[PDB]
Amino acid sequence: EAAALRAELRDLELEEARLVQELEDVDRNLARAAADLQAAQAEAAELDQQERQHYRDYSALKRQQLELLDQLGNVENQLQYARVQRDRL
Amino acid sequence: PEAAALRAELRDLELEEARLVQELEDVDRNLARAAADLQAAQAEAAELDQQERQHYRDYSALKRQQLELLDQLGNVENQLQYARVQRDRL
């Protein structure tokens, strides 16, 4: 009568076998989710790169534009001086 | 008189200023275009961030689930270990 212990062992052993099985399902499900995340992450790095390229292009072009505004400001100065002198006549 | 040299310096300056205006027009077009390219890539990334977080949620949920199931399995293992001792004692 001390082998109800046997039945207890059987029950526990199947409970474990059932968990193991479920764990197998969650594992291959976890693999599929991690691959989808990994892919999106890579896509995100890529986008970061495109963004950087467009921003750096803008910064560069901005540099050009500030210089050109300096040059233009100077020509405007010389235009102002020459037209004052001209009017002096 | 001197006013011939002036009318000429004015012609030259008006010519240079004009040219720079052109250069500036070109630079500003490429600028507005680059900013727009940027805005588009930032919108595309935003959409991508949304998807990325959804996949992260799914992955987290699976992960939580797996630790859940491993815990349970460890609780059953605690039981099986006890019965195995009580059993081996006979």
Side-chain angles (χ1 to χ4, degrees):
Chain A
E1 293 177 350
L5 250 201
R6 201 165 48 81
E8 160 147 70
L9 293 161
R10 170 201 67 223
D11 288 337
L12 295 175
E13 282 162 55
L14 281 165
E15 189 157 7
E16 279 205 356
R18 210 63 228 137
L19 278 162
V20 164
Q21 208 280 298
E22 184 63 14
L23 280 171
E24 275 186 55
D25 281 14
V26 305
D27 183 67
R28 79 188 43 105
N29 240 281
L30 192 73
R32 177 40 183 280
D36 287 355
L37 171 73
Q38 261 149 220
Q41 276 162 340
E43 258 176 286
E46 183 178 2
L47 284 161
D48 183 74
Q49 183 82 49
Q50 326 252 41
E51 270 166 279
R52 181 159 290 99
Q53 283 314 71
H54 298 304
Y55 153 65
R56 276 164 181 197
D57 276 347
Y58 180 90
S59 178
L61 290 177
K62 179 42 101 165
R63 297 293 205 172
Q64 283 186 8
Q65 190 223 37
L66 292 172
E67 249 293 296
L68 283 178
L69 288 148
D70 282 348
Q71 323 200 14
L72 188 73
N74 189 45
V75 169
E76 266 177 352
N77 285 339
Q78 307 190 345
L79 268 170
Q80 168 89 293
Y81 179 99
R83 293 170 172 151
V84 160
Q85 300 297 130
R86 185 208 38 202
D87 281 352
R88 290 213 176 124
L89 284 59
Chain B
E2 196 101 15
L6 257 202
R7 181 159 135 279
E9 168 200 2
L10 278 196
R11 160 190 155 66
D12 290 272
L13 282 174
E14 270 173 354
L15 177 63
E16 204 179 327
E17 170 172 82
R19 151 216 158 198
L20 289 150
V21 165
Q22 269 327 87
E23 248 140 36
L24 270 176
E25 253 164 42
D26 274 9
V27 176
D28 296 356
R29 177 64 180 86
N30 277 358
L31 227 116
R33 164 55 171 262
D37 280 8
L38 177 61
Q39 295 301 320
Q42 282 159 347
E44 165 140 9
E47 177 212 78
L48 203 89
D49 190 61
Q50 226 154 31
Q51 302 156 272
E52 195 180 11
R53 270 130 86 218
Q54 280 165 0
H55 290 117
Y56 181 72
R57 255 156 35 212
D58 294 350
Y59 179 79
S60 312
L62 290 181
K63 210 82 193 281
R64 290 140 167 44
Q65 171 152 334
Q66 194 197 47
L67 299 161
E68 256 295 347
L69 286 149
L70 264 276
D71 164 35
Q72 311 179 30
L73 175 55
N75 291 339
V76 181
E77 183 178 2
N78 191 53
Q79 287 185 265
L80 186 61
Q81 149 87 18
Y82 184 99
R84 270 179 88 185
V85 162
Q86 301 294 20
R87 165 84 173 237
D88 297 341
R89 281 234 267 270
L90 308 181

